[PDB]
């Protein structure tokens, strides 16, 4: 099961092109009105740029350090090479796209359920032929407008369903207690936590596997505060330890 | 899948003429009795992964001829000119399973170990999908 | 073991961006409201250039040797590539930072304990997908103004000493109590502190300017954790409230 | 370390499938007899490919070798891996939990140049993990 | 013991920077008022250039071969990479040098007692960070003025104390006589010599180890003149040989 | 100098627990009685001379575990997980003498010669000044 | 194939010149004794250098080795191939009819590291042919 939160291998990224008449950005997930550009040897998505714009004034009291601001953005250039199958549908449509020279929508589907949707017009159709190597039809499209990138269709949650399950028992020397950090705003959250003791002179704490380990090397009542966000929620676990 | 590959190749070869002892995978040490031993096998079957969206593999498919000890090298050729090449010009079956079929080499080897078998190997380079 | 005065190998260098307000250049040693970017594949920091201002004059006795000077310095163009995970924030904040032509500050934390803070804007956002290699997001930022090299903050006293004691008085409705704080290991520190309520429903906390105020929206007991700076130091206090 | 957990995860996953074969943590030297058809799981390489300015992130190769006796044709070995190893290493939740990414690398046929007793079919993956 | 007259290995070349207030060119040998820039991973001294200047006239009777003269010189650009030690003295002074942008003096001390002294203003300060490799702080200084290179502080002597000690004995066949060349202009001279016979038909001469070998293959009186400079001094050694 | 290196490393290891036979420099004579055998040594100690003004050396420091002949590979790891790694996460005594210390590899080797010893070598790459 | 034709062409051309030596199609493993004064014609390499978008155009190396007995000084082998092989390989109409182009490559002196019974002088050409 792909998770858009962990690094992904980079094989299985397919590439589609619109053929219908709607707005591709609305539901890029669905592949109903999208043709699949088959047998993609290699692709390289374009790089989103923005040239510099000066913000320097004669009256400005500085003149040694440049001041600049984001100029006008530009959505790069997407270049991909596929195997030459001239007579199969999906390549003749592409050649028509180039020779009639108009902008249509295309999308890149990573193996995450995250799809980068662009729109553009072909700027270069090529082909490289050598013996003993599959004839490559090469393509490059210049994008216009602004892609609705994958980060735009992600969602985040902070619905405050957080709790900490303690032990609060007389932890012995040579043994470690486990306290659990329940992290669910009904299923899905998007935040981390930091748990640290209140003494750091009698007992020690550690965080692993979302849970917190306490070693009471010395006795007394030891407090473990756990805080998340910038202080959205915190829990104080009280632990007792005797000399044993 | 490789079973399908060598299966198609061996079946075509044995159908052409059953005048030889045919081997699936390289024999380790031969006997003195089998000979005109035509072996067929694969080497270096590794995931090149040149094609996105799919898992494509590339391997060196060997067709080898084993004939006694000191036969003239031109006799090794004469066997392959008749029994191997005309078949391997077109192996319809095999051609279904693969995507490309490139000739790579044709080498003469001897039993440098003892001296029992002499051999000529015709090596193609193939790619396919598992 | 962290010794800036000796060479280091540079592995373990993390980098963060300012997800907050305030003055970042003051206490970059703290990790309060700094968001760390994960799985940085590689980084190339900006270089502090200079513009050679010509300084010849037809008067000058003999001209066989050039004479130039220093002008517009313009430290800029730090770039980096990290692993592509559009599922979590910190990365999403990055494409937000690209979306609007914004300037923001961000820190690079080196293994020798020194902290670097720059301020700049994103000028490139690119992705390099290939078979048999993890997809990576490659971004490039152009800096502005004078940055804050680690050689500028060259004292660091490491703190190690502090206290906190509460009023621990029953809170009347309509009035809030006040707490007592201390961050004085011989007076010199380079760290801040943050305070939070454990339940946050019977009372809340107001920390600023070395002061803490405890306001009992409801009665009962309210346990207030306080964790200072990065998180190495934490403590717990208690306060009582009665409704009548 | 993580190597022990990796080898244990793959080997238990294989043994959960159809048994009837010896299982060698690592590639052993001699195989005796009645140890035949056997499966061996070992690691080669295991370097420190930096490839991350945050942590260690070692990279290694994982080998699953299937050993058969005497002079079986390679069609016998292909039969084994297609039956008992391929359907298993298609997906292992424990394995992918343990590591970052794995890719198929290679699939070889090997014999013994010393004696000529066993024929092995080797499967090799490339696993990058945070050691 | 280093000798500036023989090729040197290029390891042990240290690099200093002025910190005092004098004239560094006067006694660059002394390191009293000079800080030592430690742990220099690599350095590349700048190259002294001089652009072409035309000397071509319309009335000049040539037009096929270009005539040019040395334009205005320029003392290159020195670039050196050291290991990143942010906190140690010597790098903070360097960063101050850059951020206050003013020319100071520096010197390079080869393993010869020869020191190339430049003065200049730093133009580029950089840093390259990769894992498993010592973080490098890279620097580049643009020199102004004119360096007082090492060839400027060398001295030459021709104090006329040379002599030649002969044998002038009946040299036999099969044996070679040795004549010595004293080159003492009071210890230190800076000139060579050439010794050649006056017949080249009876006996032969050879030069090695500052001394001269004579083989009298044939008899008679053979003369060997030794001349140095352009004719500053010469010595005629008379040698007798008989038939034996 | 290298004596100081392997001295610090061997001393730290032997202080952790004296449950093994500890070897300075690679052993070539492996009896049947020494076994669980932690060898520590250096390879490729050559003057890289990256730093001017100074002489800096770089060498591959090996820590090797020798255990019988057929032990499961996971047994080799189990020894290193407990008696080698926790020590060598930090050696202050060694850390004085050197300037950098990176991991390089961790490989399993057998007695291809006879079959007496099995071993796992953990190799770091270090640099120092002589 | 063509290989048979190349080897036969060169060997017949050599035998049309002065005889007195055994002729081995290919380099044989073992040499008798009266089997000395011997000439061997074999091929090495024989790849598929594409080098043409129209046809196969393989490329190989052609070896003509002259074997002599015992410890003859190399002046003996040079004497042989200057006399009996060089005047022949100057130009062969049949050979150049068979192939596209041949260039001289190398000329070596070899012995037997196993026994130490025969000394050989090797001549190597590079022949590019349309297989």
Swiss-Prot record, chains A, C, E:
Domain Big-1: start-end pairs: 202-244
Organism domain of life: Viruses
One GO biological process term: symbiont genome ejection through host cell envelope, long flexible tail mechanism
Keywords, comma-separated and alphabetical: Host cytoplasm, Viral genome ejection through host cell envelope, Viral long flexible tail ejection system, Viral penetration into host cytoplasm, Viral release from host cell, Viral tail assembly, Viral tail protein, Viral tail tube protein, Virion, Virus entry into host cell
Main location per the UniProt record: virion
Residue intervals of the BIG2 domain: 159-237
Cross-referenced InterPro entries: Big_2, Phage_TTP_N
Coiled-coil residue windows: none
One CC-aspect GO term: host cell cytoplasm
Compartments (UniProt record): Virion; Host cytoplasm
Role: Forms the phage's tail tube composed of 32 hexameric disks. When it encounters the appropriate initiation complex gpM and gpL, it assembles in hexameric rings that stack on top of each others. Multimerization ceases when the correct tail length is achieved through a mechanism dependent on tail terminator protein.
Quaternary structure, from the entry: Multimerizes into a structure formed by 32 hexameric rings stacked on phage baseplate gpM and gpL. Does not multimerize in solution without the tail initiation complex. Soluble major tail protein interacts with tail assembly protein GT during tail assembly.
Name of the featured protein: Tail tube protein
Recorded name of the encoding gene: V
From Swiss-Prot, chains D, G:
Top-rank lineage group of the source organism: Viruses
GO biological process: one example: viral tail assembly
Keyword Electron transport: no
Gene3D superfamilies: Phage minor tail protein U (3.30.70.1700)
InterPro entries assigned: GpU-like_sf, Phage_lambda_GpU-like, Phage_tail_protein-like_sf
Coiled-coil spans in chain: none
Pfam families: Phage_tail_U
One term under GO cellular component: host cell cytoplasm
Localization terms from the record: Virion; Host cytoplasm
Keywords: Host cytoplasm, Late protein, Viral genome ejection through host cell envelope, Viral long flexible tail ejection system, Viral penetration into host cytoplasm, Viral release from host cell, Viral tail assembly, Viral tail protein, Virion, Virus entry into host cell
Entry's family note: Belongs to the lambda-like tail terminator protein family.
Subunit structure, as described in the record: Homohexamer. May bind to major tail protein V, and /or tape measure protein.
Function: Plays an essential role in tail assembly by capping the rapidly polymerizing tail once it has reached its requisite length and serving as the interaction surface for the completion protein.
Identification of the protein by name: Tail tube terminator protein
Gene this chain is encoded by: U
